[PDB]
Structure formats: C-alpha cells, structure tokens
C-alpha cells in the first residue's frame, strides 16, 4: 500500500515476526509430547504417524530447542529491537541492510533445517562435541546467528544519525535500550562465533579429526548465557516503554530503566561458568567468581521487578483502584496485550528464584542436568518472553498490517494467553519437583517407565500441563491465522502510533542519565570485564588442547 512506501520498516519487521511465530508453531508442536513424556506417558507413536520424518524423541527435542529458543526468540529480538527504536526516533532503518538480515536469517534457517529434518543432526541446541552434526547444521546456524550482526549495525547506524542531527542531546529511552542491547549482544556472540569458526566448522567439514570438548563448552557458554538476556530484553523494552501505556498509567522512572539495561550490558557476559559448575579442568576460584558475578546480573531484574510493579500499581491507582489489591483489579484485564506480559511477569517470580538457586555454585549439584532446569527456564523464556511476544500480536500487528482485531478475536487471545500461562505454571510444578526427585533432563523417561517410581505425583502435573498446553497451542495456531489471513484492512491502523508510554513527571538525575549516555565508555568496560573474567581460563585451555573423535550415536 501507500503505507509501506513511507514505512518499509513495517514490512521487514512483519516478516521477522511472522517467520518467528511459524518457527514457534513448529517448534512447539513437540512440546505436549515432551510434557507427556515427563509424566511417564509415551505418545510418540501417534506423533510419528503424524510427522513421519521424526525418528526419535531426541530429534524432536532438537527441533523444539533450535526453533523455539534460538530461531523464534531471535527473529522476535530482531523485529522488536530494530523497529521500536526506529519508530521512537522516527527515522528509517537502512532498508538495504534490514532486508539482507531477513534473507540471511531465513537462508540460514532453511539450510540448518535440512539436516535437522533429515535426522542428520540430532545434537540438541547445545550441540556438545564430540557428538557430530552435519556441516549444514553448523553453517546454517552460523549464518542464522550472524544475521544479528547486521542488526547490530543497523541500530548503531540509526543511533549515530540521530546523535548527529541532535548533538548535545541524550539518547532517547527505547533507542538507548536497543543500543546497549545490541552492543552487549556483540561481545556475547564472539564466544559462539569463535567456537564455530575455530572448531565446529572445520570439524564438521572434515578439516580436522576431532574437537576439544572443554574448550567448545567454554566458548559456547561464553555466548550461551547472555543469549538468554538477548531473548529477554526485547520483552523488557516492551514491559518498560509500552506496557505502562496499555495498563492505564506511565513508566515511573526513565533513569531506573536505563540503569537496568546498562547493568545488563556490563553483567550479562562474564558469567558463563555458572553453566560449567560440573565441568572438570576449570578452577573452582573461577566458578566462585562467575557465581558472584551471576548474582550481580540478577540485580537489574530485581530492580526491574519493583520498577515495573510500581508502574503497574500507579496505572492501577490511576484507574480508580484503591486498597492494596484494588489497583490490581483496576488494570485492563479485558486487554490481552496487557495480560500476556503481566502473566509472564508472575511466572518470572518463581523462575528467577529458580535462577538464583542455580547460580549458587555448590547448590547447583542438587539440580544440574535434572528436570528442575527445564522447569526453571520455561518460566522464563517459554512464558515471560513468549507471552510478551504473543500479546504483542494484538497491538503490533494492526500497527504493521492495518488488519484490525475483532472483539471475538480479542477474547480468543485471552484464552490462549491464560491457558499458556496456566499450563506453564503446571508444567513448572511437575518439572521442578521431578528434578528434586533426581529425574534427568533431556531424557525419553517414558521408555524406561519403571525407572522413576518416586515421581508419580509430579508426573500427573506433567501430563496435565501436556494436554492444557496442547489446547492453548491449537488455539494460538487457529487465532494467529484468523488475523494473518484476515479479509478486511484499515490503513489508519498502520498509521496510528505505537502505544509508547509517558514517563512519570518528577525531577531526575540528569547526571546519571548523562553518565549512562557515555556508551562508548561502558561498552569498553563490559569488554574488559570479559577479557578479565574469561581471559585466563581460555588462555590455559588453548595452552593444553586435547581434541577427540566425533560420534554420531543416533
């Protein structure tokens, strides 16, 4: 339309969205069968008759991980943290790069998908060596991820163009967020790209006989942890700068919001070892270190809890809610785009508290590699991130397509979001409890059905969440297609503005705000923190390589 000629950013964004959600629909298909599995119920015969390219629980488990946690999240990131900043600034992203990044993302996705769908790379989204995937999996993933470097560049571009026409002004909020976001992602990503280039690719191409598993794990978890914050922070952009609007109030502080993001940039990367607590050949004094720095990266979220909660409370008081619970009822629960994130915000309480446990070094030996881990991280990514992405459908989609959302259509959304939340809560009880009963993660337990008798009770939750999350998922498919393929348009929807929130009016710290705008600087320090936190260990690892043959055991 005429709308896409002024705002081509709309189109590209739309694509990044649609693709991601597709990936999520497909990635998620596998979920319910994995929920039944963890409730000791084997529904995979059914799934194989419906999806015959599928040879094992583990191929499914790979598909699930790669598509939901890697692909969808990343496409969502890209849509949010490009378009949002650019809309606030009201300048156009380089439409050349913006398309290059879509095509990379898609091209790579499709390449990786080939060996995945053909059972040539059943290695899971950690792809630990010496289990050896097809080259196409590694090139394809590599090209998928790198696309993000093109996004990094796009936003920094916008930013500097804005800083030019506007010298002596502070960075705008959403745009300041996107900038530290992407910079962080840059340091974060070297871990994986390093492991990919120096190891995964030569090895998967046959240029070298084996890879050293410990270096690979170290390099992977370099990227491995912050990618999690890379998943989360698009949602926090929205929670912080949009949700207050649609809740009926404002953002209580712009400076706290910058602080949170800044803290992320500096503390998201030096913490990888908290995934390697049971690894050999990595000194304990380094683990205590990354434990302590992990506890630090909790802080911005602890901050975030209050900030957002006070913002919601204030919106609640604004709409007449009085009391201690009153303000809660006052909030717009008929509005799915309000509900989806606030629900994920609830799940994040137990989720983060799960995270705090895992971070505590020795305590990690209670839960590591057991069903507790997935019980934790579903509350995080597969609820708070996902629920946010979902409720965005009901504001971001009309903004991008002019396609309106019916009243009918809005009531279906509430269903989905709640059911999804409720299901992820039920699953969360079943998994955590099972991991405490010492049930392993990543396992087709349903095929050794007499192996974990001590966990009958939590297993019933797993089955229930299984069916509950199947109902929600079908609804979400049905619904997402009602809008996507809707027959009526309204160009004035596309033209209307994003419901960006006002900031509450009270004086603040020009001085901190000003401090935090020195982005070149903070970028360095985050980087130093990474030289310092990963330097010595990596240097000694490279000192004493010990590569080992690969194995395909499936």
């Amino acid at each position: 339309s005429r709308v896409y000629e002024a705002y081509p950013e709309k189109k590209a964004t739309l694509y990044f969205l649609v693709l991601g959600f597709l990936a999520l629909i497909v990635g998620s298909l596998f979920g319910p069968f994995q929920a039944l599995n963890y409730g000791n119920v084997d529904a995979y015969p059914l799934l194989k008759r419906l999806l015959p390219f599928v040879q094992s629980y583990y191929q499914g488990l790979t598909l699930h991980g790669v598509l939901n946690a890697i692909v969808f999240t990343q496409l969502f990131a890209q849509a949010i943290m490009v378009y949002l900043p650019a809309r606030e600034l009201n300048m156009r992203p380089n439409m050349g790069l913006m398309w290059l990044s879509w095509w990379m993302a898609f091209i790579g996705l499709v390449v990786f998908a080939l060996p995945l769908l053909a059972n040539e790379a059943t290695v899971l989204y950690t792809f630990y060596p010496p289990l050896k995937g097809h080259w196409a999996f590694y090139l394809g993933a590599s090209v998928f991820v790198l696309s993000t470097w093109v996004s990094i560049y796009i936003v920094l571009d916008l930013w500097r163009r804005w800083k030019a026409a506007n010298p002596g002004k502070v960075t705008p909020l959403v745009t300041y967020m996107a900038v530290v976001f992407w910079l962080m992602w840059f340091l974060a990503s070297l871990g994986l790209v390093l492991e990919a280039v120096l190891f995964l690719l030569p090895w998967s191409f046959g240029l070298v006989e084996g890879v050293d598993p410990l270096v690979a794990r170290t390099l992977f978890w370099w990227t491995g942890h912050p990618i999690n914050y890379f998943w989360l922070l698009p949602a926090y952009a929205i929670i912080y700068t949009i949700l207050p609007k649609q809740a009926g109030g404002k953002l209580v502080s712009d400076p706290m919001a910058r602080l949170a993001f800044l803290l992320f940039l500096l503390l998201s990367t030096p913490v990888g070892f908290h995934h390697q607590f049971a690894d050999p050949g990595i000194d304990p004094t380094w683990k205590m270190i990354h434990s302590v720095l992990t506890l630090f990266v909790a802080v911005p979220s602890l901050m975030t809890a209050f900030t957002v909660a006070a913002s919601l409370e204030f919106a609640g008081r604004l709409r007449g809610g009085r009391g201690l619970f009153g303000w809660i009822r006052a909030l717009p629960w008929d509005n799915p785009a309000f509900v989806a994130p606030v629900l994920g915000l609830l799940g994040f309480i137990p989720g983060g508290a799960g995270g705090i446990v895992n971070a505590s070094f020795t305590l990690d030996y209670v839960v590591h590699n057991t069903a507790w881990v997935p019980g934790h991280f579903h509350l995080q990514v597969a609820s708070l991130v996902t629920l946010t992405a979902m409720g965005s459908l009901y504001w971001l989609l009309p903004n991008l397509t002019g396609k309106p959302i019916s009243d009918a259509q809005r009531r279906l959304g509430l269903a989905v979001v709640w059911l999804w939340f409720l299901g992820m809560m039920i699953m969360a009880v079943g998994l955590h409890w099972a991991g405490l009963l010492n049930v392993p993660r990543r396992a087709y337990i349903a095929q050794v059905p007499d192996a974990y008798p001590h966990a009958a009770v939590p297993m019933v939750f797993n089955v229930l969440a299984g069916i509950v999350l199947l109902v929600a998922l079908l609804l979400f498919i049905y619904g997402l297609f009602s809008v996507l393929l809707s027959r009526e348009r309204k160009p004035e929807l596309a033209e209307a503005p994003l419901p960006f929130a006002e900031v509450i009016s009270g004086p603040e710290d020009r001085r901190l705000v000003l401090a935090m705008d020195r982005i070149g600087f903070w970028f360095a320090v985050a980087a130093i923190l990474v030289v310092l936190a990963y330097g010595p260990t990596l240097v000694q690892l490279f000192g004493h390589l010990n590569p080992v043959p690969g194995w395909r055991l499936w």
């Binding site: 809660i328 508290a353 209670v366």
Partner: protein, 31 residues
Amino acid sequence: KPKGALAVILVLTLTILVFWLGVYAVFFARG
C-alpha cells in the same frame, strides 16, 4: 508509599527465600 509494589517484592523475596533455603537444606542432606 507504593504499598502494592512493596507487596509484590514481598512475594518475590519470600519466593527466592523459600527456594534458596530449600535447596540449601537439600544440598546438606545429600552432603
């Protein structure tokens, strides 16, 4: 005072706190 916010962070504190002491206990039981 933002007594709603404070309620939230109350629930938040309690939750962390039950989790962390919980698992710590367990660590020592399995110790």
